[PDB]
């Protein structure tokens, strides 16, 4: 099976009354579907968390990423994680926790606590995990693309079988290097997902103040590689998509561009302000596009989901989430020094010395 | 009457769009939202679409349209977000911006300005506490200004519009609303390439610009407690620095402490340093002394301690007093 | 009458037996037909000059232009010099000629005499022209597209009725740069032209090296504009082609991105070695395609050439050539001072001192 | 073996290729073409298009890609055709490359080399003869290497791509060969971070490297000849410089001129210079003097005028010499 490349109406699967669109049989076992549900509640869940990091200054920072888990958690389920590569983003703290970096590492970078294997060195939402190959993400925008990039021709030239997945925004998409850094990959053949998780803004500015292409999926054309034009708020459609294009740079037949349209329910950020710029009839008519009850319709229709199960997920998951915080708390703060280790493998004799300099403030 | 930095800022902006339809302002979220510390607001509101635009998220497209803006016949001010992104747009910044009068042999100008947020002392991390400012200043053909107050931020913002050279200005983050100080409504300009003496003294020179300045003024408040004058001296250009000012108060003092939150390595302070010591090495009772950031990335963290502390400065001011 | 984008085959209007292949009627006057062809001979001619300046160190470098004359007489041709605003690369010097660049000017920035407008700061290649809207050229590959979309830009706001063509080859379609520009120009729907001087080698690096994408016409679809594959060889194609993006532009229907399929006869540069990486049948081949001979047929069939004419163009614009050389030479070196000179309006303290002590040298 | 530096780069990356499969060279024209330079010629022969491969003309792609690379199981040796065209893939280098392993907390490292040629006196105007070290010294997490002799070049070089840290190395072009010097075939390395002392002398400091040595070395000669013992040093790494050895030599002489053809303003010698006057100042008999590249893009045609000439380095020293 393949799915059609540069469609004018996004590819979807799941009918609103949650009946299968696929031209192709569902081949899912029930216990992956169910968990597909499972952990976009667990996303959205620790997005709600984050909000009250925020209201009680746990945290200085957070991205909202409420909506966007249709395509966070699909994507870290089309891959194998702790094998495959994973280059985010910033908002992409579900896919982070899909992919199974404990939450005591992820609330410790938010928290900045010993608890965060990236030592608080950056601000919140910068994960990193070493052990599930989630590349650090970095503030610059699109600055991951060529590093993916990277890695995928890595992947081939060691023979792996590796693929590498970059991640990113629509704004993103008008970065030089985001073109540089895919055109590089396409022309070497590599194992790269290329995945735009487009929520038709960059902060304030709009989709159509960002590019004149009429999709993103349509940019695949300049690398000549496919593109893919999918649903982002349909977990299945997402899964599906990414995971043919997935097998497909596995089997070395180069990269792809899926295009996953999704809606940012919250502000651009904790220090943005959404309610201005975006007007309120937008955000409710994509409030009910919600991927979390359209998801459960379609399980409930199979019998593969119920108010009982519901509610034990949901309380499995607050469990989770309080044991997660209170290990990254229980950490304790980072030490000052730490600000002088890791620049480089050993600290040469000017680092030594500027250390030495704030020992004495200290 | 009273205003902060943004509010100078934005005064600035507005007044100059009012004299000259070709100023125009352009960058990511400049518009509508009237910019992410609001330095731009009511502007697209006052002036439209075709005077403040937001751009597409590429660097490299805002520089290097405005210097095609300005080139042609605008007089663009063009916003970074922040001073640490300006690196995707830095050719554009060096190869083209830089040297299109220097290669044109005068045929084509540049007159643009490119402001930006920068400096630490906000938990800004790695990519929002930057003051790449060195970079600047090692290339040939861009002007650099580092304000620090709502009145001087005013008067070289206007200042840089007018200049026909390009200027990179940057605006230390942690000062926008910092403090409201008296800034007149009037029309003024302030002298680009001038520094400004924040206050006398004779035992001590205090140089300084930008993000280190409550720090520095803190620290020679302390000095005064202790009969020491130090004599603290904004240098607001960094490029054409005021080599006069600088050299008229070392000779005066005959020591020197050069504060700044960029990292110390190739940094514009050890210009300034190593320039007092090629020139004033006879009036030197002290090595110039350099209190910079560390060489290492901007640390979340311990931001708290990257940032030049009272106590640090204080540390070098007293080693080259009892040397 | 429009011609079709993204086509399979590059458009072409003049056949192998110098046949008109358009499906409008030719609407260019006799008298125009022989300027192109005339043009295209002063620009080849140029470039064998060039050689020679080579040969007797006359200049430090050169980028052999041979096989790009009809495409960049061609777009000279299609814009208004001196109204119109060109952003070309270091290869354009035909372009530069056929915009009505003095030959002056050009060799006296070969020179680095007192003759370049540019005052003998860059190296060769690097030509610049305030007067005709000439953007001196940058050495960085796809530097020049941010700008040009800027320029753009400034002419729709302004509504001077202009229109910013911009040249470059291949290799600077893998520059972020390139991308970054051409993006915001689309956006802005800003009166701008980019067009590409294919010759399928980045120096070295061979077109199938250099992208994925089939073709530099099918990038347009990233910007949701207009994208044409053109036989660059053929210089009507690409005049009614480029003319047609400029019309477009002019109007306010936002930009464009024209390929020009052309052959980089000569090597990468007076520093390269192009006999070393290319299959001699490649090159052989696409000499048969040159330009000249080939619209010289399209003229000789419509009794617009004749062996007289042809030398009779040649002896006038060897003429021209010594006249310029000449004239270059005469001006002179430029003045060891003028290194300290418009790197900003006025020299700032500091150049003032290293001027100073340069002087006591 | 005698040999240039282009053929000491070339055996070194032999070299490392022949012993460890993870070393890939990669960048524009590095393949069936050699290199423009000739630094890779024959390699891709030798080792196929999977570790020797041409890429697309892009810098960004080129750094980024190469720091993937590093950071999954590869230990490429990227290059930059022109130093001259870092500026495209600055964001990258000091974005991606420069922060990996501090933003990482170490989980994630960054095992690459980014070559590239440098330096003026070739006739290269604005962009085929800059000297951007600064940009990199300035940049915490790079190690910045410059050489000048084909013995310095093969050692270093296979020290860098053994090196687990990211290595700009930058090969002045004007040197690549100006000399046949005796260079072991024998496998051997050299120390990342250390001076290498070419004259030993009581009267005067000279501190340079890379691009200026031949006029340097000349300039000594001709000292040597007035009766005047200069003391030569060649710092070969930048980043981090032998602070040892640069105060150890200032200590004994008293006098020193740093020289470098790069742009004066924010220099790494004004680094040094600024770092000699804030340790040494008692040690100081004369001023810390520097002979740079002036303020200003490469001028081509006053190409000869830029470069530091013997002349003005022994106007430098006679300076120093008559304080
Ligand atoms: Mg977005
Ligand atoms: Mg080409």
Redesign the interface.
Request: no cysteine; charged share 20%.
């Given at each position: 099976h393949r799915f059609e490349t540069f469609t004018e109406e996004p590819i979807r699967l799941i009918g609103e009354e949650g009946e299968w669109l696929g031209d192709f049989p569902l081949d899912l076992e029930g216990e992956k579907l169910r968990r597909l549900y499972r952990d976009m509640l667990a996303a959205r869940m620790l997005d709600e968390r984050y909000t009250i990091l925020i209201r009680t200054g746990k945290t200085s920072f957070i991205a909202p990423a409420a909506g966007h888990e249709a395509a966070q958690v699909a994507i870290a389920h089309a891959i194998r994680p702790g094998f495959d590569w994973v280059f985010p983003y910033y908002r992409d703290h579900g896919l982070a926790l899909a992919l199974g970096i404990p939450l005591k590492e992820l609330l410790g970078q938010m928290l900045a606590t010993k608890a965060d294997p990236n030592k608080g060195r950056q601000m919140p939402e910068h994960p990193g995990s070493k052990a599930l190959n989630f590349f650090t993400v970095a503030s610059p925008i699109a600055s991951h693309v060529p590093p993916a990039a990277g890695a995928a021709i890595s992947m081939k030239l060691l023979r792996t079988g590796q693929v590498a997945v970059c991640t990113f925004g629509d704004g993103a998409t008008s970065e030089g290097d985001w073109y540089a850094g895919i055109n590089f990959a396409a022309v070497q053949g590599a194992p790269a997902v290329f995945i735009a998780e487009n929520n038709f803004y960059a902060i304030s500015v709009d989709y159509r103040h960002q590019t004149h292409s009429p999709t993103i999926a349509d940019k695949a054309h300049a690398f000549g590689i496919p593109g893919y034009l999918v649903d982002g708020m349909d977990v299945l459609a997402s899964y599906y998509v990414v995971k043919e294009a997935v097998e497909r740079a596995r089997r070395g037949e180069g990269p792809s561009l899926v295009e996953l349209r999704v809606y940012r329910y919250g502000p651009h950020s904790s220090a943005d302000d959404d309610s201005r710029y975006r007007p309120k009839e937008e955000v409710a008519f994509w409030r009910k596009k919600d991927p979390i009850p359209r998801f459960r319709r379609f399980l409930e229709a199979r019998g593969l989901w119920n108010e009982e199960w519901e509610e034990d997920v949901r309380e499995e998951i607050r469990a989770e989430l309080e044991r997660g915080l209170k290990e990254a708390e229980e950490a304790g703060p980072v030490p000052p020094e730490w600000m002088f280790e890791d620049v480089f493998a050993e600290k040469p004799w000017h680092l030594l010395r500027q250390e030495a300099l704030l020992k004495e403030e200290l | 009457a009273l205003m902060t930095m943004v509010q100078a800022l934005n005064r600035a902006l507005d007044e100059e769009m009012a004299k000259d339809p070709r100023v125009?302002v352009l960058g990511?979220?400049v518009?509508?939202?009237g910019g992410?510390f609001l330095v731009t607001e009511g502007l697209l509101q006052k002036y439209g679409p075709?005077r403040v635009?937001?751009?597409?998220?590429?660097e490299?497209?805002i520089?290097?349209?405005?210097?095609?803006?300005?080139?042609?016949?605008?007089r663009?001010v063009a916003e970074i977000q922040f001073a640490?992104?300006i690196?995707?747009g830095?050719?554009?910044l060096?190869?083209?911006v830089?040297?299109?009068?220097?290669?044109?042999?005068?045929?084509?100008?540049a007159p643009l300005v490119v402001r930006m947020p920068s400096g630490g002392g906000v938990?800004?991390?790695?990519?929002?506490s930057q003051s790449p400012e060195?970079?600047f200043?090692?290339?040939?053909?861009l002007?650099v200004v580092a304000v620090s107050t709502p009145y001087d931020a005013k008067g070289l913002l206007k200042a840089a519009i007018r200049d026909?050279?390009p200027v990179v200005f940057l605006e230390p983050k942690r000062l926008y609303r910092s403090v409201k100080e008296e800034v007149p409504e009037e029309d003024y300009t302030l002298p680009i390439?001038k520094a400004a003496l924040r206050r006398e003294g004779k035992d001590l020179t205090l140089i300084c610009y930008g993000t280190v300045m409550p720090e520095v003024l803190q620290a020679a408040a302390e000095l005064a407690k202790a009969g020491v004058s130090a004599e603290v001296l904004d240098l607001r250009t960094l490029?054409?620095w005021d080599?006069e000012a600088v050299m008229n108060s070392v000779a005066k003092t005959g020591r020197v402490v050069l504060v700044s939150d960029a990292?110390?390595?190739?940094?514009?302070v050890?210009?300034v340093?190593?320039?007092?010591?090629?020139?004033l090495?006879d009036m030197?009772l002290?090595?110039?002394?350099?209190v910079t950031g560390?060489?290492?990335?901007y640390?979340?963290?311990?931001d708290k301690?990257?940032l030049p502390?009272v106590?640090?400065i204080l540390?070098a001011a007293k080693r080259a007093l009892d040397y």
């Open positions: - | 125009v990511e979220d518009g509508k939202r992410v075709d635009m937001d751009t597409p998220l590429s490299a497209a520089v290097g349209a405005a210097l095609g803006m300005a080139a042609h016949g605008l663009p640490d992104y690196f995707p830095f050719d554009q060096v190869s083209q830089a040297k299109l009068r220097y290669r044109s042999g005068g045929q084509f100008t938990r800004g991390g790695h990519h929002h060195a970079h200043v090692h290339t040939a053909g002007k026909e050279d390439g490029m054409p080599y990292p110390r390595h190739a940094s514009f050890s210009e340093a190593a320039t007092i010591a090629e020139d090495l030197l002290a090595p110039p002394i350099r560390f060489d290492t990335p640390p979340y963290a311990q301690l990257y502390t106590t640090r540390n």
